[model samples]
Target: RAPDSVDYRKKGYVTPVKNQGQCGSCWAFSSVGALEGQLKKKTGKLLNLSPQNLVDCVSENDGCGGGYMTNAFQYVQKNRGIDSEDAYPYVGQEESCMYNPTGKAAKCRGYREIPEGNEKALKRAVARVGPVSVAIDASLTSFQFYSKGVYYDESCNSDNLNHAVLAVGYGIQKGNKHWIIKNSWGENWGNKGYILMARNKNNACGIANLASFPKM
Candidate 1:
């Protein structure tokens, strides 16, 4: 997937969703989700993009999962982009992306991705490319669950969502710190909105897979 692609999968987006809970308001996640991609696109650094700011200030924050990625992008684009975590702070669930508290969005600069045929393209993107946006089979039982358990199955169809996430890095378990995933479920949700999966997951639902981010 490439950032220029019209396919949302080809492009990428990250989101500071871990801070929130099962608010079901994917809007917040969707918002940061897109900005996260825009951040890496320009900065070349995996910044902790703000979802709180969008929820706190943006009128779209009317509730959870109420807006689309573009709506979130619009908020950040107009506001200059999202700020750091310490600057804003996510409160989880009812906490909402706060404002009058510091959080701000940066400018939408640029983006990139790998070509096809390279099943492990995401891996290359990390060491060589930038952060990439992807999707997952959030219905991975333990995910809807948490704490700890054998992570099994990739039946995205029967799973939970048509959800998306960011691929910060790639690696093998206890092997190499290659793959580190960023999530939008909120930090308090899963390993602080971050998780580890085998780079060789081959774009599995549980493997943090998505075509790319869809920038407007």
Candidate 2:
């Protein structure tokens, strides 16, 4: 059952925020973030997993061009696991595929996608499973320098989601309901590596539209 609210960061379930640089590799970052959260919850180890591994190895994605969380999970299942960031590291730019030996990788059994346009299902998944990978149209000006507050802009086009992020948890701040989401824009950005996005308003930013989590 879902609680009154949940915060995975307070419980020590999230890793440090990272910068994806100029690459359109947000998909891989969000995929790695979701899997890393699941790994921590199941094994109590906070690993800086490798998005570079996915970028270089997974044919389902176009390296730094773009990809999907569903394709990423399938790659993990097929390869059995992925390497650490320290071992593989982030290039932030697309390159020819390289099979680097970054020690044994943190693998998962599989993954699950929440029903599209269902916020409650996404909430239950984050509360019960782990951090969820989601896509959103983060092209608005309000999203660029977002520092604090429950972010809600009717101008944010949900139909054109171009970025990926991790939904860590949900709560209410100053009587406004929100979901705590982790972005790949680095710790220097957005609430020190996070954003309290407006929640329960029919898929704001298309957040719940493509929510998903990996299985351990």
Candidate 3:
């Protein structure tokens, strides 16, 4: 069962907002964000896993060029685990793989993908499964300059996903429903590194198109 609203931040499952800089490594950040949430849910401890590890080490990904969250999760599962941000750290660029097995911080058994184009399924995943890795059509200037409020750009295509983010919760404000999303654009962007995206508007921004979560 899922709740009417959910906020992982309030439950201490969401980690601090992170920046991907000029790198197109949002997929890695989104992947780690989901894993971080699941790790906290299972271990009662919030561990900052390294997106840098995925950026540099995940051979199947394109590093700064772009990638998919599911691919990152698969790498973590097959590699047995991932390293901490402190141990691997984020350089905002692709470098030689420096993963140290001894520095592993969190592990995922595998992952599960939500049914595509289903906002309700995405909502249930966020409410019941913690934060979820999601892809979105973030090419609109409105999305880029989004500061606050329930963001809804009718021009935001649902089929042209170009960015990845984490859906940490959902709620209604002034009778307008929205999903609480964590971005990898640092604390200065959006509502303190987050965005309240309009929900149930035919999957605005493709929030539910490729949604997924790590398994522990």
Q: Which candidate is the best by lDDT?
A: 3
Query: What C-alpha lDDT do the candidate models reach, one value each?
Result: 0.50, 0.87, 0.92
Q: Please say which candidate is ahead in TM-score: 1 or 2.
A: 2
Q: List the residue pairs that clash in candidate 3.
A: none
Tell me how candidate 2 scores on lDDT.
0.87
After superposing all C-alphas onto the true structure, candidate 3 shows an RMSD in angstroms of 0.8
What stretches of model 3 exceed 4 Å from their correct place? none
Candidate 3, residues 42-66, lDDT tens digits: the string is 9999979999999998999999999
Clashes of each: 38, 2, 0
Q: Model 1: per-residue lDDT, tens digit, 25-118?
A: 4555544554555566666544565556656666764654444444555665566556766687655444544554244545553333344324
Q: Report the candidate with higher lDDT, 2 versus 3.
A: 3
Native-to-model Cα distance after best TM-score fit, residue 106 in candidate 2, in Å: 1.0
| Residue 42 Cα positional deviation in candidate 2, in Å, after optimal superposition | 1.6
Q: What is the TM-score of each candidate against the true structure?
A: 0.55, 0.95, 0.98
Q: Can you rank all candidates by TM-score, best first?
A: 3, 2, 1
| Tens-digit lDDT string for candidate 2 (61-126) | 888889998899898888877888888879998766655545655887888888888988988888
